Design a protein around this ligand. Structure first.
Ligand SMILES: [Cl-]
Ligand SMILES: [Cl-]
Ligand SMILES: [Fe+2]
Ligand code: NI
Ligand SMILES: [Zn+2]
Ligand SMILES: [Zn+2]
Length: 284
């Protein structure tokens, strides 16, 4: 099976994310569990947890279908001790909120080095940030998202994800999410099926499909290898529809949240339906 949705708004409460995913007929969704531009939030109440779990059950969303995203403030590779520890505290908190809400995955961008430490030292700080969070929680997998590679952000090479995974000690609770816009911006071509196979053969050899826990399905307003992170609606950008035809037919993308982060949410329902229809058996 494939699970297909979008990063929907949590405005008004977390249960509203499940309701909004249902309104666009998604079979997966993403959300922020708290304000993505703040370091902390009110503790979850038993009421808020209960309302959120009841909505997930009502609308047929198990934890295997939900891919929360961490905040924009967290840098798990930060070169300054105080800021690294602030980020590790907030990331632990994000993982704890996920456990309390019945979730099992947490998608995050890995970190950035600010040109103050080497890439390899930054990657090792990120791995150890994951190790700390995993030692303090249960049941939640740290899902590293690849990036476009703006500024001093890492995660734009598959080798970055693999170097982090190598430093994580409990490999049963680490994985990756491939964002197609980020990969294209970073120079992994996706414009034909043959280029998709090339790119994911590189992914297989460096990271491994063993670790694939989600996808973000985004076309790209930016150009090939621009290293600029700007999404587009599926098939309106520089990737085109073919990569998403190919993903929907390939079984290496089964069983995981496939999450739209496309720029026009008024056509999310259309995009979800288009993705689902690709799975219908077509005559010769
Ligand atoms: Cl980036
Ligand atoms: Cl292009
Ligand atoms: Fe993404
Ligand atoms: Ni129903
Ligand atoms: Zn992201
Ligand atoms: Zn992006």
């Amino acid at each position: 099976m494939k699970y297909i949705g979008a990063h929907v708004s949590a405005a008004g409460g977390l249960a509203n994310a499940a309701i909004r995913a249902a309104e666009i007929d998604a079979t997966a969704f993403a959300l922020f569990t708290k304000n993505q531009r703040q370091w902390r939030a009110a503790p979850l109440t038993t009421q808020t947890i209960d309302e959120f779990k009841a909505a997930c059950e009502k609308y047929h969303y198990t934890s295997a279908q939900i891919l929360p995203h961490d905040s924009y403030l967290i840098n798990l590779g930060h070169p300054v001790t105080e800021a690294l520890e602030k980020s590790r505290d907030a990331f632990i908190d994000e993982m704890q909120r996920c456990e309390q809400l019945g979730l099992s995955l947490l998608n995050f961008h890995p970190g950035s080095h600010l040109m103050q430490i080497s890439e390899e030292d930054c990657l090792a700080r990120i791995a150890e940030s994951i190790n700390i969070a995993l030692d303090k929680t249960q049941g939640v997998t740290a899902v590293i998202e690849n990036t476009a590679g703006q500024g001093s952000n890492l995660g734009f090479k598959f080798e970055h994800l693999a170097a982090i995974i190598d430093g994580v000690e409990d490999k049963s609770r680490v994985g990756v999410c491939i964002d197609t816009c980020h990969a294209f911006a970073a120079g992994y071509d996706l414009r034909t099926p043959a280029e998709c196979e090339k790119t994911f053969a590189d992914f297989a050899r460096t990271v491994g499909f063993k670790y694939l826990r989600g996808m973000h399905l985004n076309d790209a307003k930016s150009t090939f290898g621009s290293r600029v992170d700007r999404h587009h609606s599926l098939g309106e950008g520089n990737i085109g529809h073919d990569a998403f035809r190919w993903i929907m037919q390939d079984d290496r993308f089964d069983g995981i949240p496939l999450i739209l982060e496309t720029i026009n949410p008024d056509i999310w329902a259309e995009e979800i339906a288009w993705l689902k229809a690709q799975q219908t058996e077509k005559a010769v």
